[PDB]
């Protein structure tokens, strides 16, 4: 029954409309859902705009009039110029009249703010179409009607605010460059009159709602108007005094003064400098006397969250930081301005104690600006000594967790570290004193807590490298000594676990100290080794992260023979490795072995390095040897989940060590390589035999997932070594041939759901590093993975996402390093290669789309480098316009805006080939064009026809002017892109001006 309004052969029943609307906004459940679908269909009727003048006159529902204006909005922005000129004047007239009559009825003006704002925006859309060329008296008449009524004057400030927004703040995306400039110049020409009205209202007016609406418009004006309207008038005085006292006007006025602090200003005039000082002086004065004194506890105020306090304190932080970052030098020399300078910063100190993550980051950014300047600028830091001393405490007490998963906490820690490092350089003594004092109150329990000891330990660790080695040594000693005593002072593994971790974090941050005190460094490591036996949650993971963290920095001191030692300490670590790691989880054992590989790589004697490597790998190599013996004996053992897990952990240990050692890992790799690939084959057979006997569901089972883990870690190990190898002859002559024989056929002949995407990733690295040396191997890779992978991913954009990504990474590196492989493809396979590139264009997936566009660009360059030869001539004849049209399609379909830049680059390269005569053969067929026609003429002809059928609502003149500008600008990417954007605007509407494409000229 509600679907009656969707029948236009009959008169629209307004009462039926108001019912559908009410059911949608106030209803619920099914009735709401039904009405919603009816309203959507009504609004999208291309004739629904004709019935808007009826709704706005005879409806009693504001939501219905709002929807009516939305229907008008679509019509004005997309099809205005298609109407008869009588409807344009009519629509204009009854939008103007509707606004006038809403402002005159004080009851409607008060209770229908949403519908009036919607009408003002609708009017603004008309202005963008019709003003000033077809409405030169709009601004003069607006200024006249403002004096006849406070309500109309207030509403005209809303109209001007919205106009300024649409012309200056949101025009870049929504208009052509020519149209944007036209309107910006039009508003600039008549602003002298607009400012006069605005300034008179502010100086004389008393209606607070009128004042606030005028200041909200001023906020938009300040984005673009010249500074003279601000400094050659009394408006700065008004903002910084009068309007800072009223809480109604205070919020907007403060935002206005923040923008004023960003105006383009000549930095050499002394009167202006005084004016900039003065409005800051007035503003701080009004805050101290009308809002709160500089001693006020803003942390407590913000937490109470009364009224708009939180917004005001946010806006004050933005104002103070913006002004001071630009102008604080104006306050630093004159002694009579010193109190103002420091009161402003004391407010920022108080603001910095607020518990609000994002506000703290705003003030922290300013503090960075300040302490960095005091670090380099002569004679400045003594001014801020008391500010800096308070800041040291604020930052130490609000220090956040370093990475030692939250990526918002990692960025903030590094920001805090930066400022605190600067603050330490500025006064090392004050920083040390605060930290020791803070540590004393951890020991007397007055401030003891898990949060407070962690925060202090992070702060202490963050300033590493700022003190002198002698002070650092005294400092580190006191801290560790005090922290160790704090550990005994506590009971319970929970307390002793917190303090233990903090102690190890601090020592891990001062490697300079550890490197100079061997006996200490040694004892530290031994404690970690004993902490690897403590089963308490977190200890073992801590012990291991600290060990490898210390090793990365102090590795040299583990590989040499230290005084009073009979062997390099690495040997002692390796001897007791089974005992040390006996209680660790697999992940933690691998980190340990990785840390040992870091040390071993410091030994540059090949013979001793390989011996250490052999000893480190003794345990996994003996387990390996044992399995390879019995695993081949009874291949069913690999169905034993215990053997599978053991194997996977042995391989993961080799991956860990290979990650640290890279090229030095080759000896160990050769020990397992040939038997590892045999294992890869045996595991493969079982996966295949399991899927044959159980179906595809077998791939989800723990048995098969464990078997595939083996294959994946084997590929990761080979990938890890090859990507770091320095001896590429051995890679090619020893590694590649057994590898390809082991993985390629297995990948090709498995069903889609059993193929490992890691094979593709592994091959990508092989091609990357030695691609130039195995042209036959690359060909073999394409034959085995290309067609069977493409058929997996060319039916939709969702299935096999990992294969999708790795597939185009592989084609990309093959196209870079061994383009000859594609020249060998049969014509039908090269056609699939082209199809696959364009298929990548159409992905929203960024991983795929970007590579697809790069492959296309690189392919064009590869072809071009071939010169005038048959293969290049045939490529252009077969695929030039396919790439041009496919590229144009994603440029204009509105679903691939993330790739605009690279689409534009590809299109500019394609167009420039024809206009530099880099294509030797005609791109047309003998028949369709006269003999001797230039490819330029045919290109513009093809594109003109292509765009005419794809965008039939464009005029032939538009298309012609767009292409003329586009081809003329194919050597200037920024201008090229601007012309494409202009085209993307014009295709959204009817009647685009073809001269807009002459903007660059």
């Amino acid at each position: 029954s509600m679907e009656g309004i969707l029948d236009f052969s009959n008169d629209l029943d307004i009462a039926l409309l108001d019912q559908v609307v009410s059911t949608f906004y106030q209803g619920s459940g099914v009735q709401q859902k039904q009405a919603q679908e009816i309203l959507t269909k009504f609004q999208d009727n291309p004739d629904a705009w004709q019935k808007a003048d009826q709704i706005l006159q005879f409806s009693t529902n504001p939501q219905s009039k709002f929807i009516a204006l939305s229907i008008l909005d679509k019509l004005i922005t997309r099809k205005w110029k298609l109407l008869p000129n009588d409807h344009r004047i009519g629509i204009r007239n009854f939008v103007v009249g509707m606004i006038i009559s809403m402002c005159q009825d004080d009851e409607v003006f008060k209770t229908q703010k949403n519908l009036i704002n919607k009408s003002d925006l609708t009017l603004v859309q008309i202005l963008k179409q019709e003003w000033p060329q077809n409405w030169p008296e709009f601004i003069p008449e607006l200024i006249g009607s403002s004096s006849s009524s406070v309500n109309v004057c207030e509403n005209n400030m809303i109209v001007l605010k919205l106009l300024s927004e649409e012309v200056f703040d949101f025009s870049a995306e929504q208009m052509t460059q020519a149209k944007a400039l036209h309107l910006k110049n039009s508003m600039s020409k008549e602003f002298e009159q607009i400012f006069k009205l605005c300034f008179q209202v502010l100086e004389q007016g008393s209606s607070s709602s009128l004042i606030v609406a005028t200041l909200e418009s001023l906020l938009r004006y300040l984005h673009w108007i010249p500074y003279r309207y601000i400094y050659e008038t009394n408006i700065l005085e008004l903002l910084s005094t009068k309007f800072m006292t009223s809480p109604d006007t205070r919020a907007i006025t403060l935002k206005c003064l923040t923008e004023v602090s960003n105006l383009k200003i000549p930095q050499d005039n002394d009167l202006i400098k005084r004016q900039t000082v003065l409005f800051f002086q007035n503003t701080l004065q009004q805050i101290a006397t009308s809002v709160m004194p500089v001693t006020a506890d803003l942390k407590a105020t913000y937490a109470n969250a009364n009224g708009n306090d939180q917004s005001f304190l946010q806006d004050l932080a933005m104002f103070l930081t913006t002004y001071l970052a630009r102008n604080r030098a104006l306050l630093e020399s004159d002694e009579s301005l010193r109190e103002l300078l420091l009161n402003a910063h004391q407010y920022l100190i108080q603001l910095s104690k607020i518990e609000e993550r994002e506000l703290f980051k705003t003030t922290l950014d300013y503090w960075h600006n300040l302490v960095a300047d005091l670090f380099y600028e002569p004679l400045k830091k003594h001014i801020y000594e008391e500010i800096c001393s308070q800041l040291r405490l604020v930052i130490i007490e609000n220090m956040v967790r370093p990475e030692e998963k939250e990526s918002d906490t990692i960025q903030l820690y590094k920001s805090e570290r930066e400022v605190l490092v600067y603050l330490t350089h500025l006064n090392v003594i004050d920083t040390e004193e605060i930290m020791i004092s803070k540590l004393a109150r951890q020991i007397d329990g007055s401030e003891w807590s898990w949060h407070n000891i962690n925060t202090l330990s992070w702060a202490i660790g963050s300033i590493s490298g700022t003190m002198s080695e002698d002070t650092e040594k005294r400092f580190v000693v006191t801290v560790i000594k005090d922290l160790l005593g704090l550990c005994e002072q506590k009971r319970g593994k929970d307390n002793k676990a917190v303090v233990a971790s903090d102690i190890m974090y601090v020592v891990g941050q001062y490697p300079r100290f550890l490197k100079a005190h061997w006996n200490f460094l040694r004892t530290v490591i031994l404690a970690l080794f004993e902490f690897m036996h403590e089963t308490h949650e977190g200890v073992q993971d801590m012990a291991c992260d600290t060990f490898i963290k210390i090793v990365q920095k102090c590795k040299y001191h583990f590989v040499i023979q230290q005084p009073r030692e009979s062997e390099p300490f690495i040997q002692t670590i390796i001897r007791d490795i089974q005992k040390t790691t006996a209680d660790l989880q697999p992940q933690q054992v691998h980190t340990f072995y990785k840390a040992c590989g870091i040390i071993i790589s410091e030994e540059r004697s090949v013979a001793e390095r390989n011996r250490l490597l052999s000893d480190l790998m003794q345990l996994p190599n003996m387990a390996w040897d044992t399995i390879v013996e019995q695993s081949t004996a009874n291949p069913t053992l690999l169905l034993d989940s215990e053997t599978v897990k053991i194997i996977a952990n042995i391989i993961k240990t080799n991956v860990a060590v290979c990650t640290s050692m890279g090229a030095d890992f080759y000896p160990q790799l050769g020990h397992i390589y040939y038997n590892m690939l045999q294992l890869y084959r045996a595991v493969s057979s079982m996966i295949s035999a399991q899927v044959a006997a159980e179906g595809l569901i077998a791939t989800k089972t723990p048995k098969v997932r464990g078997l595939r883990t083996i294959k994946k870690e084997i590929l990761k190990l080979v990938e890890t070594y090859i990507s770091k190898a320095r001896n590429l002859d051995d890679v090619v002559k020893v590694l590649v041939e057994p590898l390809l024989n082991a993985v390629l056929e297995d990948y090709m002949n498995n069903v889609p759901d059993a193929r490992d995407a890691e094979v593709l990733n592994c091959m990508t690295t092989v091609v990357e590093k030695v691609g130039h040396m195995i042209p036959q191997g690359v060909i073999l890779i394409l034959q085995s993975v290309f067609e069977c992978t493409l058929d997996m991913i060319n039916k939709d954009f969702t299935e096999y996402p990992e294969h999708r990504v790795e597939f185009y990474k592989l084609l990309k590196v093959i196209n870079e390093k061994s383009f000859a492989a594609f020249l060998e493809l049969p014509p039908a396979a090269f056609k699939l290669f082209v199809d696959a590139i364009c298929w990548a264009f159409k992905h929203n997936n960024r991983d795929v789309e970007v590579n697809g566009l790069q492959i296309a660009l690189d392919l064009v360059k590869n072809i071009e480098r071939m010169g005038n030869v048959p293969f290049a001539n045939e490529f252009h004849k077969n695929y030039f316009f396919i790439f041009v049209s496919e590229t144009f399609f994603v440029l204009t379909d509105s679903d691939h805006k993330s790739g605009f830049s690279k689409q534009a680059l590809l299109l500019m390269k394609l167009i420039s080939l024809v206009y530099d005569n880099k294509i030797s053969v005609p791109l047309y067929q003998e028949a369709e064009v006269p003999q001797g026609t230039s490819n330029q003429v045919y290109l513009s002809q093809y594109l003109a026809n292509m765009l005419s059928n794809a965008f039939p609502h464009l005029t032939s003149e538009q298309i012609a002017s767009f292409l003329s500008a586009l081809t003329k600008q194919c050597k200037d990417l920024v201008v090229f892109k601007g012309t494409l954007r202009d085209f993307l605007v014009q295709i959204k509407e009817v009647g685009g001006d073809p001269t807009d494409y002459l903007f660059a000229e």
Partner: peptide
């Protein structure tokens, strides 16, 4: 290195014993 630290840190391993 200060010799009293050693005494306190060598007992560090036995914190969980």
């Amino acid at each position: 290195v200060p010799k009293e630290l050693m005494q306190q840190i060598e007992n560090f391993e036995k914190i969980f014993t």
